[model samples]
Target: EPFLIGVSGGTASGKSSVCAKIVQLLGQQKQVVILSQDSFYRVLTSEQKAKALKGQFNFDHPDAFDNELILKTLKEITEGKTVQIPVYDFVSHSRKEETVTVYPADVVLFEGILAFYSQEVRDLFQMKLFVDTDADTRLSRRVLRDISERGRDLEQILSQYITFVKPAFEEFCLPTKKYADVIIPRGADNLVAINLIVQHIQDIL
Candidate 1:
């Protein structure tokens, strides 16, 4: 059976980057695959779409994900079934017409803010990695990234973070920390922890 790993953390906390580093550390082998929870977002209703366009929607909320679909997909992936993962379009706030095929692999790393939210889904992981970057650092990264690269409004970005993202991390994401087998402080910046984790995975499987 393939080794299944879950990577969870706050928004812009470097969970995604750390996943990349882990894969890179593992020598860019084809045996590894990183699946994103963003791909399993539930389609928004018209009203919800409008709210999302205005940055008023709470994507940080657990309900924002497709629960049943994710559960089924994760199971199939771990069981070595070739699965078609959904392609979600942020602009449309729904799935794209075509899905992406994710083949079976030796190490499947699933990353998201709420990757550990569902216990049933959580049960499949052989390892759970929690990336812990300070909230201030995360928010700062978000503000700069959103404004410069994504062309988002500074005021609105800050507002949404204050309203949705921070609260969701506290209420939903943080509680799942206890479930993690490893808590990586400062995310990929903590190379010592990442190196240890890489060594452990190497020795174990």
Candidate 2:
């Protein structure tokens, strides 16, 4: 069976960067795949889109994700089956018409803010990691990312962070820390932890 790993953290906590490093190192020896929870955001309605534009959408809430689809996709990927992952547009607050095909791999790494939100989903992972970073650092990274990549303004990002993101992290994301097998503080900046995790995966392989 393929090794299943879950990576969870707050927004801009470097979960993606950690996963990228793992994939970069593991790719030399194994067929590895990194699936993002962002890809499973529920398609928004016109009303929701309008709310999102005004920074009223609670995207950090679990309700923001298509949980059933994410679970199904993960199951299929682990079972050596192919699946089509949706493409989500952060700016538009909706899904794009097209999807990306994700094939089975030797190691499957799934990353997200609420990656460990469900017990059923948590049970599927052989390894679970949480990337812990300072709130200020995360917020700064988020600001830069939203501005450059998502085309969001500073004011909107701060508003969303204050209104939804921060509270959601405390209420939902933080509680999942107990479920993780490893907690990586300082996020991707901690090379030692990342190296240890990579070695552990190698040992398993």
Candidate 3:
């Protein structure tokens, strides 16, 4: 079975950067693949799509994800099976037509805001990581990222954060921190934590 690492954090907590760094360091010697939880967002229904356009969607909540699909994908990948991973469109709040084929690897790193939300899913991970970035820092990064990548305005981003992101995080995401094998403070900025984690994975491999 592959060494599975699940990285979880609040929005814009640098989980992606941490996962990328791990993959970059380990890929040199191991077959490493990174899976993004964003890919498993539940496709919005027609009514939900209209609400989403108006910033009424609560994307941060656990209900926003298709957990069954995510669990299936993880199980398949861990068993050295190739799987077609879904591609989600954040702008349209739906899945795209095409899917990406992910081959099994020595190390599988999955990162997202609610990577450890489900107990069954959490149990599959060999290492669970929580990127504990400060709320203010996360908010700042979220604002910048949404504006640049998602074609969102500052006003809309903040509104969504207040209405959905922050509350869902408090209600659902933060509680999962207890499941983490490691809690990484300040996100990717901590080299010591990063090095130690990489070393642990390397040793296991």
Candidate 4:
């Protein structure tokens, strides 16, 4: 069976970059695929849209994710099939019609904020890693990403982080740290830890 590794961390914590590095290093020896959790965020219906517009939507919480759908999709991916991942627009808080279809591989790395929240999802992973970066760094990176990639503005990003993101991380995401097999502080900058994790995964290969 293909190994599924789950990576979780705070926003802009360099989880994506680290995942990329791990893949680049492992690619020479294995068939690795990356799956992002962002693709699983629940698409807001018109009613949810209205609440979101009023700044009442909690996009960062576990409830923000469609866990049942996520679990099912992971199962399909692990079973060696192609899966169409939803394309989410952060600024709009909705999914685009286009989807990214990923084929199954020998190694699948799944990264997202809520990767470790469910036992079913957790069981899918042979290894789990959490990237830890400072709050200020995360905030700045998130602002930049939202502005450049997600088409968000500074004020809105700031407001959203203050109102939803930080609290969600504190209340839900952070506590799940205990579930991680490895935690790398300062994220990608902690190359030593990343290398060790890479070595560990490689050994299992």
- When superposed on Cα atoms, how far off is each prediction in RMSD? 1.6, 1.1, 1.1, 1.4
Candidate 2 lDDT tens digits, 128-204? 99999999999999999999999999988998899999999999999999999899999877889988899999998
Better candidate number, 3 or 4, judged by lDDT: 3
Model 3, span 1-205: residue lDDT tens: 7888999999989999998887766655578888999999998899999999998888888989999999999998878889999999877787999999988788889998999999999999999999999999999989988888888889989999999999999999999999998999988888789889998998876
lDDT tens readout by residue for model 4, 29-125: 5788888998889978899988887777888999889898899989998888888888887768888999888776888889998789888999999
Instruction: Report the Cα lDDT for candidate 1.
Output: 0.90
Clashes of 4: 0
Estimate the TM-score of every prediction: 0.94, 0.97, 0.97, 0.94
Candidate 3: residue 26 lDDT (0-100): 65
True lDDT of residue 133, candidate 3: 92
Q: How many steric overlaps does candidate 3 have? A: 0
Which consecutive 10 residues in model 2 have the weakest lDDT in total?
A: 22-31
Q: What ranges in model 2 sit over 4 Å off?
A: none
The candidate, 1 or 4, that scores higher on lDDT is: 1
Error of 4 at 113 (Å): 0.9
- As a whole number from 0 to 100, the lDDT of residue 146 in candidate 2 is 97
